[PDB]
Design a protein around this ligand. Structure first.
Ligand SMILES: *[C@@H]1O[C@H](CO)[C@@H](O[C@@H]2O[C@H](CO)[C@@H](O[C@@H]3O[C@H](CO[C@H]4O[C@H](CO)[C@@H](O)[C@H](O)[C@@H]4O)[C@@H](O)[C@H](O[C@H]4O[C@H](CO)[C@@H](O)[C@H](O)[C@@H]4O)[C@@H]3O)[C@H](O)[C@H]2NC(C)=O)[C@H](O)[C@H]1NC(C)=O
Ligand SMILES: *[C@@H]1O[C@H](CO)[C@@H](O[C@@H]2O[C@H](CO)[C@@H](O)[C@H](O)[C@H]2NC(C)=O)[C@H](O)[C@H]1NC(C)=O
Ligand SMILES: *[C@@H]1O[C@H](CO)[C@@H](O[C@@H]2O[C@H](CO)[C@@H](O)[C@H](O)[C@H]2NC(C)=O)[C@H](O)[C@H]1NC(C)=O
Ligand SMILES: *[C@@H]1O[C@H](CO)[C@@H](O[C@@H]2O[C@H](CO)[C@@H](O)[C@H](O)[C@H]2NC(C)=O)[C@H](O)[C@H]1NC(C)=O
Ligand SMILES: *[C@@H]1O[C@H](CO)[C@@H](O[C@@H]2O[C@H](CO)[C@@H](O)[C@H](O)[C@H]2NC(C)=O)[C@H](O)[C@H]1NC(C)=O
Ligand SMILES: *[C@@H]1O[C@H](CO)[C@@H](O)[C@H](O)[C@H]1NC(C)=O
Ligand SMILES: *[C@@H]1O[C@H](CO)[C@@H](O)[C@H](O)[C@H]1NC(C)=O
Ligand SMILES: *[C@@H]1O[C@H](CO)[C@@H](O)[C@H](O)[C@H]1NC(C)=O
Ligand SMILES: *[C@@H]1O[C@H](CO)[C@@H](O)[C@H](O)[C@H]1NC(C)=O
Ligand SMILES: *[C@@H]1O[C@H](CO)[C@@H](O)[C@H](O)[C@H]1NC(C)=O
Ligand SMILES: *[C@@H]1O[C@H](CO)[C@@H](O)[C@H](O)[C@H]1NC(C)=O
Ligand SMILES: *[C@@H]1O[C@H](CO)[C@@H](O)[C@H](O)[C@H]1NC(C)=O
Ligand SMILES: *[C@@H]1O[C@H](CO)[C@@H](O)[C@H](O)[C@H]1NC(C)=O
Ligand SMILES: *[C@@H]1O[C@H](CO)[C@@H](O)[C@H](O)[C@H]1NC(C)=O
Ligand SMILES: *[C@@H]1O[C@H](CO)[C@@H](O)[C@H](O)[C@H]1NC(C)=O
Ligand SMILES: *[C@@H]1O[C@H](CO)[C@@H](O)[C@H](O)[C@H]1NC(C)=O
Ligand SMILES: *[C@@H]1O[C@H](CO)[C@@H](O)[C@H](O)[C@H]1NC(C)=O
Lengths: 443, 124, 119, 443, 121, 445
């Protein structure tokens, strides 16, 4: 009765992994890379009667995100002035004047020899450094902290790294499926799915401990975790309300520069204008307490209402392991959140978090060439929105019904999973067959 | 309707949306080692397009979005009525259901077309 | 005659040189640009071939279609178009009505494809 | 009545920008190495009967590629050459006074410095002669090379030739080159003597400022072309219909010396001179030049009126690259005075010697960045070149006095190639189209 | 037999393997470029053959009769020798100096045929 | 009464060279890193019945990729490694007499210099042992390294393995590889036992001079192949049907020291030697060698006459790269003497022969003037055993018709090493379209 009929242009697809295009809305690094415009605005086709499975922890879009961000970064530093000539013995003293007690020992006044553009001529340099970038050799002799492990390169002062939003676009033959179910927890079937050509804009914001300047959850705190009962996994907490945080490095500065080589310029500090104070960030405690209450009741959904949830500080490690970390106006801040994660939940009033500043940056947890951040003239202040948190369980319980949670942090991929969880990439497969009462006519 | 808007539609309902589905396979007209990555992506799109076109040519369906063949449908693959298949089932569901017979049908279709051309030589 | 040679004559005359024109289409830093150029030529070729397939007459140099000609595009008579105009002039004359036809051709192609299935 | 008929292989086209490739018309030079692709045994030009087409040399894109290609090639060829960072040392210099014609007082200086040998610890005292044009005072005084405060210095490789052998540009598949053969084509607008071709003729990538050497000639009369005739913000290009020869020399007999300054790293220097010191210079017939100007002023009056007076004056000032006639002769770089060529008023041996300067370190392309350095050339240099055209400018600020002074012009290197490229346009071939007919598909 | 298994077989016998041969033609920083160049040229060759069959009106066939007569100046061998004794490798050598001629005979007869058909609708 | 018929999918081809790609089976080995592409299971072959093809191993240009890609990979591997530029300083050296066999004859030197450390203002006195072959006197005497006047020296990365693994070469779509199975094939001419494969078996990229190690053996008999038999300027490639084992040792116990020369830049050096000092050497059974030569001389005579005398001798001279048997054993570079091996006349418990070997650290790899490689010392004692599978020989020529000829070890060209494995393969391009006559005219409706 039935015969095989071949149909081409069949609207079906398979899971697939491909290369994506980066595009943006028309000197930074991002816009000079993601040069493909997102300027036109076609939107999406909702798929009626389509259920599809998503898994944010098994996605590869995040790998492409991670890889390309790092590669872009390296390309941007590639053509900049090297600091090799700076790996010399430094003679340093302490800073005792015009400084508060809390800052004593943080800064050092160093003096050293440097070359000039002529090979047989040298100059003395006087500059001020943070102790985090300088170690003792054993007034005392010091060296820069990374001259024993890797080359140090100065980032170009005219290159902006501002994380403008970027969009990813499918290559022809592929499509991006998007889950818009407000209750989606990161895995499994989603029944409200639309198809798009490009993702919405995502800002490639880099941070530790807290998730800044991302999307908010819709009407609830959503906690997404690959393995809920496994303390080896972190959890991503998405808030439906932002929390405002005001950060600054309040002291005024000077920026000086010298020529070391043939058009090779180096930037450094000199003096602090006014006195010396600690960098810090301000959050109202009222909003912080409200935020935690929302998070805590959400956590209890997996532990029981009667569970006591305690917060505590980081377990230990380097600054990129234990502190909050972000770029504010081009500067690199490390903030102590131990006084933030200090409550226990049992069934303006601001908080100031002290912060440290560091100029030699080991990015991506990749030991290799270090980046040097030249100083910024003036006083830096910025305001950011906290949109989520990275936390961990201690685990190792005795079923006490009480558990302490710690700020997490670690991998950077997680910073993008929080935005990319909604997207899936598939390959279109237009060819297929089906039965029909139609025999080919043979002549 | 729109591209892939027919994905949740029944197989029958979706049979009339094939032109958009086919046209957009070549939509990538308008659009460092980065350039190399994208260059390969373009090459792959071409390679996929061509393997499907060659196969339709092999089966004698080069001029058709929809072609009847002389390979009978085998009820052992899916012993279900035509009415369910076209009016209730969607193409996504259908494809999953017959995903383990693809290697059979391609072989049957290749030889069936070869047989017809060979048989034509007795006319010529 | 010569490739692009017929451009000096009428639309009608040029109909026998279509295979001339159809023949040359497939004729460390630096090589990147050259390889991309080769890719683009292929993409343009394939697009046009796909469109002819979309519009039914995939194998013809010339095909009549089932889309009627509109006087709103051109109301000039054939006795003047085919004999007095060149293809360049013609293309310039109807340059607004391209993107619409491409769509009309699917409409006038797929209906008969359906009315071939019920055999 | 009428139906749409689809045609494929239709002989029509559209203006386009695509990438062209180069070919060499039949042995270490850069041009031959790069344009390794052979040219056709003979291109054919197909005339198009009954056509008119519009060309515009100032809106061309072929020139942009030529510019890009020449810079790319230039740099790629210099990438593997010896870097001369070791020369940026304090120099001890005095004037050369023996056997010097008074016109050459100053100019050369006798410098001495301590150069690094292939071993790091050993140094040599090296003596050499440099032109003052490449050397500045630091303040038997201390001196440095002019570019040690700006950029890297690279020695151009002595084994690499830059002879501007003519290169042909060829269309990629799907594209064609149109050529304008009209005798009077002024660089813009409709052209009726139109033909098509696969490739252009060979164009010699000759580089010069002010006066154009070894280019094409006008076929009937001197023709002057400009983007905007009445706008003094634009230059004018004069294509002569007859060539004028210019004889250029560097009379001093140079002895080349060299030193190994690294592991197979060789530096070449000027050594000393055999015989008396004389200045470089160029010879042009006066009568020939005067006749040439006559031919030019006749064309200029076509735009300005019978009653006008055309005066010529010298350049306005600036870098040697713009104030002098900058060109390569025998591998050496000449910066010749041209005031003697532009000192006359036209109202409605018999030769001139132009003095020339020689400069070794060059900021080619008007780029700020690394500068090439010519190696010294052994012996005495002589060449004879053909003057084929000029770059000129209007004075501007006219009071309608009927007298106008023209000044030597100059400009971007692209303008030197527009001189050939005004004859060409590139288009894309578009084989599909439709037309009406009394023919319905036989459905 | 399998891909190229028919290479030593006679011309007639070899007509039975035309689709294995067809399928295996298509279903395939300095390093990456060498690979891409190979892939691109394979496509270009593929397309030329398809284009040419299209030019001749043979795109829908593995084998097509044409309107161009066979010449004794190319081969004066018996039809039975050609199909029953000879192989395609031998044959290709035998007529290797005429293929470039034949191609344009096919082009013209196809153009005349399409024109004749156009005149009838 | 016949018509032209066009046929597509015709199983024919044209000879052609194209780009080949590599693959390998089955962890910092450079070969594996590059040939990351997997191989498939072995059923990639069809025998071609009724096909005779002409092969020519010396006109086979796939070997050119072997001698291009191998070079490229080598340089790619060294590209990111530590530069030794800062070490080109005046050295002050003396001899060593401590527990040394007399026959070292000053091979090693006790030498020191002022090295620049990671802080630019500091020096470190460094003491180490050097081979005489790496060091040239300037004139505690002053010396410099041999290559500081010619090129940069780069230290090879100690974490990268260079052990050759079999590499398979695979055809791109549209191409196929024709394999000759004729056991008597002499490198050229028609072959009737021809099969087609899409990818070859793997060949280890072993690099050596004079003697060919770890290759394939001939079946049944020794086969001698050359481009022009009576032209004494050609290399003779001898493929043995039995291997000969050779035991190569660098017997002294070693210490490897390292110093930081820059910001994460480490240099490795020799320290001192544990125990007394002995010469490097290789051991070959004399009888096995003598039997091997007997097989070879019979095969040589069949092309020169069977009334001749075959003589073996060492090379005429040149640098170590051509006068010695050059090879990599355990990562170390050996330059072994062969004059006592090639010392014979043939006229119509093991008793092995020990050959002395020299060791070098500064290497002019590929006999290419350009960047030099520095081989860091290897901790411990090295011993390896290799399979001698063939020879490279040349003749003196200059015949006086004395029915006597002298054969000497040849070498230098590396392509010739791979030809010994590649002679069985040819690459062709498929041409599926063609025409033939028929009784059928196109039917026109
Ligand atoms: C989370 O998201 C918020 C925004 O929603 C980000 O906040 C922005 O941060 C950047 C960087 O610190 C701010 O940019 C700076 O603004 C200064 C103030 O602007 C003056 O000038 C403008 C005109 O351009 C006036 O309209 C305005 O009233 C002020 O008078 C500038 O002075 C700064 O200039 C410096 O950088 C530029 C490079 O762009 C150089 O060219 C200058 O010479 C100079 O060095 C700079 O432009 C921005 O204003 C903030 N936006 C808002 C709304 O506050 C957070 O940073 C982000 N958080 C994270 C973690 O990503
Ligand atoms: C720059 O280098 C010079 C040496 O060239 C240092 O000067 C020496 O300092 C020590 C310690 O005070 C004295 O004992 C020496 O006599 C000084 N030598 C000379 C030539 O002056 C100088 O201190 C270094 N300066 C900096 C800022 O590092
Ligand atoms: C999604 O499924 C619904 C049914 O759940 C489809 O609704 C049908 O719509 C047609 C046209 O209006 C009616 O004739 C049918 O009677 C409706 N079905 C039922 C059960 O009432 C809807 O069209 C589907 N969407 C898509 C894109 O196919
Ligand atoms: C290889 O060649 C032999 C002939 O030498 C082929 O054998 C013939 O096969 C046909 C099959 O139709 C028989 O009718 C003939 O009688 C056979 N000839 C003889 C002398 O016995 C063989 O088939 C060829 N094989 C391949 C793969 O081409
Ligand atoms: C080459 O090395 C091998 C070891 O890999 C030697 O083989 C051994 O020889 C001894 C006799 O001296 C036997 O007792 C062992 O059983 C053999 N071992 C193996 C694995 O076969 C071989 O003799 C050496 N050849 C030369 C010339 O030195
Ligand atoms: C400088 O400050 C640090 C931190 O307070 C302290 O450890 C160190 O001893 C101080 N050194 C001097 C100069 O007293
Ligand atoms: C955030 O979630 C809480 C808990 O579901 C809800 O009470 C609150 O109104 C939500 N806030 C917003 C802005 O939607
Ligand atoms: C938590 O709050 C108590 C209030 O008495 C304070 O003593 C303690 O130091 C705080 N802990 C942290 C980490 O800030
Ligand atoms: C149908 O399927 C059965 C096995 O279920 C198999 O034996 C038979 O050969 C198949 N027929 C066709 C035409 O595929
Ligand atoms: C398929 O067959 C069953 C059993 O006869 C029947 O109930 C069902 O309605 C048929 N399917 C459709 C879609 O009609
Ligand atoms: C076309 O129309 C013109 C009037 O503009 C008329 O002169 C000419 O004969 C017409 N051609 C025909 C016969 O269709
Ligand atoms: C070389 O160095 C010495 C330092 O002892 C200095 O006096 C001399 O002037 C230098 N020579 C030159 C030519 O610069
Ligand atoms: C032009 O000539 C005058 C007179 O000799 C001179 O003063 C002026 O500097 C010259 N300008 C240039 C650019 O040569
Ligand atoms: C060092 O050894 C060499 C042999 O390699 C010898 O010629 C030289 O005289 C020896 N020098 C001393 C000081 O023993
Ligand atoms: C380092 O240089 C000094 C120069 O005063 C010399 O005496 C010393 O021996 C050198 N060190 C070495 C290891 O050669
Ligand atoms: C090697 O060749 C010789 C002579 O050709 C023969 O006697 C011997 O048996 C062969 N050995 C093997 C393993 O085939
Ligand atoms: C091969 O060598 C012989 C002897 O050297 C010579 O006569 C001959 O010309 C060479 N070439 C050939 C194969 O003819």
């Amino acid at each position: 009765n039935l015969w095989v009929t071949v149909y081409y242009g069949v609207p079906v697809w398979k899971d697939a992994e491909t290369t994506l295009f980066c595009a943006s809305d028309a000197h930074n690094v991002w816009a000079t890379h993601c040069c493909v415009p997102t300027d036109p605005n076609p939107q999406e086709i909702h798929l009626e009667n389509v259920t599809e499975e998503f898994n944010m922890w098994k996605n590869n879009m995040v790998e492409q995100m991670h890889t390309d961000i790092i590669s872009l970064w390296d390309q941007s530093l590639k053509p900049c002035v090297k600091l090799t000539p700076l790996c010399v013995t430094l003679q340093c003293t302490n800073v005792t004047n015009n400084i508060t007690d809390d800052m004593r020992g943080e800064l050092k006044n160093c003096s050293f020899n440097m070359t000039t553009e002529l090979r047989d001529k040298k100059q003395k340099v006087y500059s001020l450094f943070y102790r985090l970038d300088v170690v003792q050799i054993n007034n005392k002799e010091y060296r820069l902290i990374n001259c024993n492990t890797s080359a140090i390169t100065q980032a170009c002062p005219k290159v902006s790294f501002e994380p403008i939003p970027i969009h990813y676009c499918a290559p022809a033959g592929f499509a991006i499926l998007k889950c818009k179910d407000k209750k989606f927890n990161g895995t499994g079937p989603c029944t409200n799915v639309s198809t798009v050509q490009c993702t919405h804009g995502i800002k490639p914001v880099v941070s530790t401990q807290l998730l800044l300047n991302g999307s908010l959850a819709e009407e609830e705190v959503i906690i997404r975790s690959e393995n809920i009962t496994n303390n080896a996994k972190n959890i991503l907490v998405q808030l439906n309300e932002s929390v405002q945080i005001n950060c600054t490095r309040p002291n005024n500065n000077t920026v000086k520069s010298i020529r070391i080589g043939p058009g090779q310029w180096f930037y450094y500090t000199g003096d602090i204008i006014g006195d010396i104070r600690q960098a810090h960030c301000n959050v109202s405690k009222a909003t912080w307490n409200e935020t935690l209450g929302k998070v805590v009741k959400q956590l209890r959904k997996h532990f029981g209402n009667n569970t006591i949830i305690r917060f505590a500080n980081s377990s230990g490690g380097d600054l990129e392991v234990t502190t909050h970390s972000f770029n504010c106006g081009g500067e690199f801040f490390y903030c102590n959140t131990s006084g933030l994660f200090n409550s226990t939940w049992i069934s303006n009033d601001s908080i100031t978090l002290p912060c440290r500043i560091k100029q030699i940056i080991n990015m991506w947890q990749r030991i290799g060439q270090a980046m040097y951040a030249p100083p910024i003239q003036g006083v830096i202040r910025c305001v950011s929105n906290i949109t989520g948190l990275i936390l961990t369980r201690d685990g190792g319980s005795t079923n006490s019904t009480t558990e302490t949670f710690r700020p997490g942090g670690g991998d950077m991929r997680d910073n993008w999973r929080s935005e990319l969880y909604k997207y899936k990439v598939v390959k279109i497969e237009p060819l297929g067959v089906a039965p029909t009462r139609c025999k080919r006519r043979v002549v």
